[PDB]
Amino acid sequence: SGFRKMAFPSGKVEGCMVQVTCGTTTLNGLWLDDVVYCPRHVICTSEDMLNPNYEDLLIRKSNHNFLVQAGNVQLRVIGHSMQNCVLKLKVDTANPKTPKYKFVRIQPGQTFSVLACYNGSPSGVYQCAMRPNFTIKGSFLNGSCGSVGFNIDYDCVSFCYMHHMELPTGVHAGTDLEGNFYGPFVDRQTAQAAGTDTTITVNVLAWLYAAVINGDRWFLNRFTTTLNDFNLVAMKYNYEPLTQDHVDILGPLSAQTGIAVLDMCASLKELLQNGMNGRTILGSALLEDEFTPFDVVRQCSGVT
Amino acid sequence: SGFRKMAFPSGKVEGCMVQVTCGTTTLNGLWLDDVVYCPRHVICTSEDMLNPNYEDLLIRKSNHNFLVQAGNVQLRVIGHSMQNCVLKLKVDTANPKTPKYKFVRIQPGQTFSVLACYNGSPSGVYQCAMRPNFTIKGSFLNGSCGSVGFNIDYDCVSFCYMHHMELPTGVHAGTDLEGNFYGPFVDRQTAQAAGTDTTITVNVLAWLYAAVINGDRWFLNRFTTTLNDFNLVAMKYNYEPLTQDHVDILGPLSAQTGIAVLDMCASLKELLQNGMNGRTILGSALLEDEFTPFDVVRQCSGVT
Ligand SMILES: *CC(=O)NCc1ccc2c(c1)OCO2
Ligand SMILES: *CC(=O)NCc1ccc2c(c1)OCO2
């Protein structure tokens, strides 16, 4: 019993983190097979960042300008290319600790673990969600760029995020491992404002199910609702609309707890309208939206 | 910028987790050097758990009754002993992935990472605190016993916790790696009630400092207080008393932010008396007490 914001075990990803230096810029790279993936802004001065032309900056860079260190051993760079906003550095050594892996572009609402790294060295691991405005609310200091977000399916690491920048509001933007930013962000030190950070309704519902499973039931009410009625309330409260796809995804939690999805919706409706009245659910005074239905099933069933 | 509940990277501990089976009971063990440490209740039936005599139960057990599996390879058990509430299984192979390690008994308020494991396989990692009533609020299902709590100092894992049981209230109790329970708990399926789960005041203050550092300042007020005045309010609100030792520990955060500890105390006082008024601090609607001053310095400075 009990329900915790839980990251994936980080060992498989720890074994992939390296330091990438280009001139005076040091950040993290991800070493998979004989390729080191890192943010392309490794080639920039903080001056360059104001208005970088990456193709033009990259012309001035040779393989030997990319210093790649894995532990305290230097890797030989034998090729480099830009793919969108990441550099792929070909090295002469396959990472012997390469896990089975995929590159996946996640949808907003999807959760993943971040292994925060500095100089290629893991400092910590935490659980994040792709916000509906395609930001994440991370913990990233200067040097943390190239830290990666990931999910694990048994023995396969799906890399979904690489850290690139902090917006002036101190929320985070980055790319998939093909170098494509989540959302409209660019790797340039310019005014970039996030859109509305809406609540991930399907994640809140999952977490309400997690609460019932773990004995926190005080918020269960006598009401039901409809998707349309619920959605009017959701919209008013900057919650994402709930679709029948979301209702389908919650089916197993519905079945386990015997609480119809639309009944749990009506409970959430009353919580939005009435607030918590100083009460907590699973030790939180606000409605947690950084657990997916899959996350709740995983943690409640003990998947390894 | 940003501040996350952050666990230590788990790789060093993942490399130590094994499955221990005695008859029909399977749980996790920690393999360090040629010793596998696991909860002594591995020898119990759920019937035994009602009133176990462990010395008497252990007489019926030989080395070959302890089945130790590391990945999908069996370790040979060549000795076993009971130390308090843990078994030490001597194996003929030193764990080749043994990190530098210590066994440490932590104080209440102290935070650590848990690597939740089932059948010796890591499922997840989360950050905990030893509650002032010597419980922890974990996420543990049947099979999770022998999962360990730890801190990392650069390359040295300090193991502080091994999971043993869930109280009827669904909070958790366990031992240090010498097998001594935190608090008054016993490895017996009997009524065991926790004492008052008070708030770890020094941890709240650290986290208020973390909030100021990361730009959340709305709660800073125009007041100061004294340790005695603050403590009267703290006591009333089931907060632990603040000592001069706590004030000393917060000194560096005080210095970094230019906010005197007693001023931050007066801010916390007003938050207790006035509540959050629907506002959040670092994305929380309640005052977080599971970051130590050391945790706040570490995450705010990016230690690896
Ligand atoms: C996010 C990141 O690490 N990018 C590279 C970088 C940015 C700013 C900065 C440093 C590195 O070092 C000091 O300041
Ligand atoms: C906490 C733990 O894993 N202890 C051993 C154990 C207790 C209950 C239980 C099982 C193992 O398997 C099923 O139920």
GROMACS .gro file of C-alpha atoms in nm, chain B residues 1 3 205-221 253-254 256-259 264 267 281-282 296 300:
model
   31
  305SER     CA    1   1.582   2.642  -1.198
  307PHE     CA    2   1.288   2.204  -0.767
  509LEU     CA    3   1.237   2.572   0.627
  510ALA     CA    4   1.496   2.424   0.384
  511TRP     CA    5   1.218   2.383   0.122
  512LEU     CA    6   1.098   2.745   0.181
  513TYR     CA    7   1.460   2.850   0.112
  514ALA     CA    8   1.452   2.625  -0.204
  515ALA     CA    9   1.133   2.810  -0.308
  516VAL     CA   10   1.293   3.159  -0.265
  517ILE     CA   11   1.602   3.036  -0.461
  518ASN     CA   12   1.365   2.917  -0.746
  519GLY     CA   13   1.159   3.243  -0.750
  520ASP     CA   14   0.849   3.150  -0.538
  521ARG     CA   15   0.862   3.441  -0.285
  522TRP     CA   16   0.492   3.537  -0.226
  523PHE     CA   17   0.493   3.395   0.133
  524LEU     CA   18   0.794   3.602   0.253
  525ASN     CA   19   0.650   3.841   0.517
  557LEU     CA   20   2.069   2.870   0.282
  558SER     CA   21   2.027   3.177   0.507
  560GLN     CA   22   2.268   3.237  -0.001
  561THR     CA   23   1.921   3.400   0.016
  562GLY     CA   24   2.002   3.679   0.269
  563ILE     CA   25   1.693   3.566   0.470
  568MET     CA   26   1.194   3.242   0.746
  571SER     CA   27   0.710   3.335   0.737
  585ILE     CA   28   0.482   2.693  -0.324
  586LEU     CA   29   0.704   2.500  -0.569
  600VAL     CA   30   1.821   2.161  -0.092
  604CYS     CA   31   2.032   2.381  -0.589
   0.00000   0.00000   0.00000
